[PDB]
Amino acid sequence: PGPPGVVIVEEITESTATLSWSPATDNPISSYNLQARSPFSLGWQTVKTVPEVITGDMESAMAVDLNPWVEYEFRVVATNTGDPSIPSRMIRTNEAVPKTAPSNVSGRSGRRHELVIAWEPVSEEFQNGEGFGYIVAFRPNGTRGWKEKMVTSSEASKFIYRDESVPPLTPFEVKVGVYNNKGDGPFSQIVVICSAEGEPTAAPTDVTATSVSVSEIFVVWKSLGRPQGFEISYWKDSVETVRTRGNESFVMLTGLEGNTLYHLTVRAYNGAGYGPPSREASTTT
Amino acid sequence: PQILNMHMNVQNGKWESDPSGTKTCILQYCQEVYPELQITNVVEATIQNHTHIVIPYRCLVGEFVSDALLVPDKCKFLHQERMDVCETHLHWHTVAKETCSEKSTNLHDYGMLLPCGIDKFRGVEFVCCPL
């Protein structure tokens, strides 16, 4: 069969677009099929219509189950299956309240009095309107009331709250909701994230370095900021830094020069930063 | 940082008089009082040294960060915003208070949103609490 002429979108709602088209050429047509495309669609995709089956005598239909505030583009296909029609003009569905809360509400590393809350941003496909934003609600675990913060950036993925009265590693119940111009949306499920844990504050003590071979030296050492690992700097008399195999209390320097005096310092680190250096140890291969 | 005229000593926590001793009865004064800070805007919130009850102007530093409002239990967190308007702080305070009155509640706390000028904003956040 021939292709339809072009799609004319007559009425637009939040999830519904009433559209018509000029009929295709019968070379007896069984049905017309409707497809739409959005910046979030993986190409052209079929749409649900009213009526469920668009018979051959019908030149119009009502596309349903569309997403609010999403740009769309329609085309018709005839089947007795022929070529699709010319794509319609770019329309956009009407605004609606948001129905999708952000996922992966979690925490991040921060400073000693920061509560770093993070979340996966919501794409425009599920913002459902202009003026989209987030509502970050948090409270100490077990308390009643909430502290709420409005994040007006639609692309924002985290928020940092600074409170000098909140001690480090304090658990907080956290919700992250959504809103737009037409009204508020739902909140995410309550998650519990701890605050702060700043940079490691204590330096390693009893740093003992001992020569093992002509090119190897074994080092061993022993708070407020939890250590995620230790970085060890060693110089001869050429600065070189090395790290541990996780949160361990030792390293083995390799590839050193024979019968050579080396100096050494150790310091811990985590996601927030580094700690203070240790006392300078030294041995000779 | 907030503001003869008197200002808040951010290092001690007390109120000091005008540095030159001449300025009496806003954004430019915030910047001259705190030259080490980047004062970008001002917004409305008892001082002796003879007592006087005044509502000080907060010298907003750097980019605007909306205030974190406290929502006690059994209260509601509400907010209004219009990208096609730009009103004053007194307007949004009255809007927030009248909105709680329409719902037969009281205005417990409020804050400004989306600045659009010197002490003028495009939105408001507030908390209505039951009677």
Residue numbers in the entry:
A (entry chain A): 670 to 696, 699 to 751, 755 to 896, 901 to 915, 921 to 968
B (entry chain C): 32 to 34, 41 to 62, 69 to 88, 93 to 96, 108 to 189
The authors write:
Contactins (CNTNs) are neural cell adhesion molecules that encode axon-target specificity during the patterning of the vertebrate visual and olfactory systems. Because CNTNs are tethered to the plasma membrane by a glycosylphosphatidylinositol anchor, they lack an intracellular region to communicate across the membrane. Instead, they form coreceptor complexes with distinct transmembrane proteins to transmit signals inside the cell. Finally, structural analyses of five CNTN–amyloid pairs indicate that these proteins interact through a conserved interface involving the second fibronectin type III repeat of CNTNs and the copper-binding domain of amyloid proteins.
We thus initiated crystallization trials with the E1 domain of mouse APP and the FN1–FN3 regions of mouse CNTN3 and CNTN5 but only succeeded in obtaining a crystal structure of the CNTN5–APP complex at moderate resolution (3.5 Å, Rwork/Rfree = 0.243/0.291). Overall, the binding sites identified in the structures of the CNTN5–APP complex and the CNTN3–APP fusion protein are similar to the one identified in CNTN4–APP structure. Residue H137 in APP contacts Y681 in CNTN3 (Y853 in CNTN5), and its side chain forms a hydrogen bond with the carboxylate group of E686 (D858 in CNTN5). Finally, even though residues T751 and V752 in chicken CNTN4 are replaced by K823 and M824 in mouse CNTN5, these lysine and arginine residues still form a hydrogen bond with S124 and van der Waals interactions with H137, respectively. We found it interesting that larger residues such as lysine and methionine would mediate interactions identical to threonine and valine and wondered whether these changes would shift the respective positions of CNTN5 and APP, thus affecting the “fit” in the complex. Indeed, the shape complementarity coefficient SC for CNTN4–APP is 0.78, whereas it is only 0.65 for CNTN5–APP. In CNTN5, the arrangement of residues surrounding APP A126 is distinct because the Cξ atom of F833 is located 5.3 Å away from the Cβ of A126, which is too far to mediate a van der Waals interaction. In this complex, A126 only contacts the aliphatic portion of K821 and the side chain of Y835, which, respectively, replace the methionine and phenylalanine residues that abut A126 in the CNTN4–APP and CNTN4–APPb complexes.
